[PDB]
Design a protein around this ligand. Structure first.
Ligand SMILES: O=c1[nH]cnc2c(-n3cc(CCN4CCC(c5cc(Cl)cc(Cl)c5)CC4)cn3)nccc12
Ligand SMILES: [Mn+2]
Ligand SMILES: [Mn+2]
Ligand SMILES: [Zn+2]
Length: 456
């Protein structure tokens, strides 16, 4: 028996509201962050055309065995076209229920999905065209390509809700990052079939995500608000310990399927929604989510970070350090990059960056005084941004260094962050060297440019 969680908020913005996606996302934030996910219905006449061919685009989908509480890899079998996948998808659903595929009630698919994943001697597997790269396959939204594009797709070309634009706009703080993260600047495509699923997870660096269903049968979501993140993690710790064993890579994550009623039983707040074609779902920072597809469909998604998010981004990297988990990028390097472009930042952005930078500088000041008192005296400037990430990860906590690190001639090439000075080697501290990006004297004028910028 399944008792569906309460419905998450649904917004229908006017065209005035809709005009600026970052303004609207900020407006709804007090509501939507209480529930983790929300749904956004665009104005009725906002209807972007679809830019992908059914025969000339191929992919190999991941196989999915329907079993609850059981580890999978976050990123990990024949080849299909969009047409052949859809023929497979539709045949599966109609055969499964012995019905025409639109006559299957969404409530029934939902009951049946949760029955399926918890019943052990039913062996049902499905496939999911998941994590297909926008860059190779092509966006479902209109893009500029030196083909010609019809007028109607030229209106949608510059829309903030065109997901190609969202993470490159100026109120998105990830825009300024030069490093081709790709995992976080570029849209990803999901081709679903009935019962194909995504496990409970949160986004890298506790970022937002926005998901658009271009067409097909709905996508069912469950969401948990950010404030209940650790509570959900505690609940999952008791029931399925294996997922929490520290993984030796950022591409070795362990996620799982778990009944939202099990969470609700343990007083974790869960909300649901059926996202239909032409609707957006937004996930908020550190908000756990999971779900499954009702049928053959096509979705596109991207991460993004608002200025609202900057302090959480700092907190997240601190949390990764405690977990010894790899970073996608250095948060500090991103702050300093923006500071170095202070003359051309949005003024609200420059104001928010300056606030985070002040914390960075004070925390850096305290850490440096501490390693000095430990006997590290030798120091030398180092341009950390030039090192590939894997060559500047702390040996202990795996954090990507930028502000500073400790090295020793004893263990060449190795670095620790300043939290793990005692973890580098066994040589005395006077053999150590402090590598730093900036003197405190470099930092304060950078912050000043931001202040000047913000007060104009
Ligand atoms: O409907 C859904 N279906 C599937 N997944 C959903 C979902 N999320 C999926 C992700 C993981 C996306 N993944 C991150 C790593 C990315 C990456 C980066 C790099 Cl440099 C190399 C590689 Cl090989 C891969 C590829 C894209 C996060 N949320 N959230 C909500 C909804 C859904
Ligand atoms: Mn099973
Ligand atoms: Mn997600
Ligand atoms: Zn460290």
């Amino acid at each position: 028996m399944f008792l569906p969680p309460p419905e998450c908020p649904v917004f229908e913005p006017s065209w005035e509201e809709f005009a600026d996606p970052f303004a609207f996302i900020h407006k709804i934030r007090p509501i939507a962050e209480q529930t983790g996910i929300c749904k956004v219905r665009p104005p009725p006449d906002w209807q972007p055309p679809f830019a992908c061919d059914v025969d000339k685009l191929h992919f190999t989908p991941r196989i999915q065995r329907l079993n609850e509480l059981e580890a999978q890899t976050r990123v990990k079998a024949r080849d299909y076209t969009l047409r052949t996948f859809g023929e497979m998808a539709d045949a599966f659903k109609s055969d499964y229920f012995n019905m025409p595929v639109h006559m299957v009630p969404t409530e029934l698919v939902e009951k049946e999905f949760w029955r399926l994943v918890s019943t052990i001697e039913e062996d049902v597997t499905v496939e999911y065209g998941a994590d297909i790269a926008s860059k190779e396959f092509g966006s479902g939204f209109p893009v500029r390509d030196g083909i010609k594009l019809s007028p109607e797709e030229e209106e949608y070309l510059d829309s903030g809700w065109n997901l190609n634009n969202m993470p490159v706009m100026e109120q998105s703080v990830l825009a300024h990052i030069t490093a081709d993260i790709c995992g976080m600047k570029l849209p990803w495509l999901y081709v679903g079939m009935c019962f194909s699923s995504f496990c409970w997870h949160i986004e890298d660096h506790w970022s937002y995500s926005i998901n658009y269903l271009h067409w097909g049968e709905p996508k069912t979501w469950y969401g948990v608000p950010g404030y209940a993140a650790e509570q959900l993690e505690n609940v999952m710790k008791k029931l399925a310990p294996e997922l929490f064993v520290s993984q030796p890579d950022l591409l070795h994550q362990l996620v799982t399927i778990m009944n939202p009623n099990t969470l609700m039983t343990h007083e974790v707040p869960v909300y649901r929604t059926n996202q239909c074609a032409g609707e957006f779902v937004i996930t908020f920072p550190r908000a756990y989510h999971s779900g499954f597809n009702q049928g053959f469909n096509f979705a596109e998604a991207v991460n993004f970070c608002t200025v609202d998010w900057l302090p959480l981004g700092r907190q997240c990297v601190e949390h990764y350090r405690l977990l010894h988990r790899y970073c996608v990028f250095s948060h500090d390097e991103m702050i300093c990059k923006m500071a170095s472009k202070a003359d051309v930042l949005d003024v609200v952005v420059a104001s928010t960056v300056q606030k985070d930078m002040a914390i960075m500088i004070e925390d850096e000041k305290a850490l440096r005084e501490t390693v000095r008192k430990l006997g590290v005296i030798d120091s030398e400037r180092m341009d950390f941004e030039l090192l590939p990430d894997d060559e500047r990860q702390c040996v202990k906590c795996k954090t990507t260094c930028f502000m500073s690190a400790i090295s020793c001639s004893c263990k060449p090439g190795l670095l620790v962050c300043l939290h793990h000075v005692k973890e580098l080697c066994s040589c005395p501290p006077y053999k150590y060297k402090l590598r730093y990006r900036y003197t405190l004297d470099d930092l304060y004028p950078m912050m000043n440019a931001l202040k000047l910028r913000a007060e104009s």
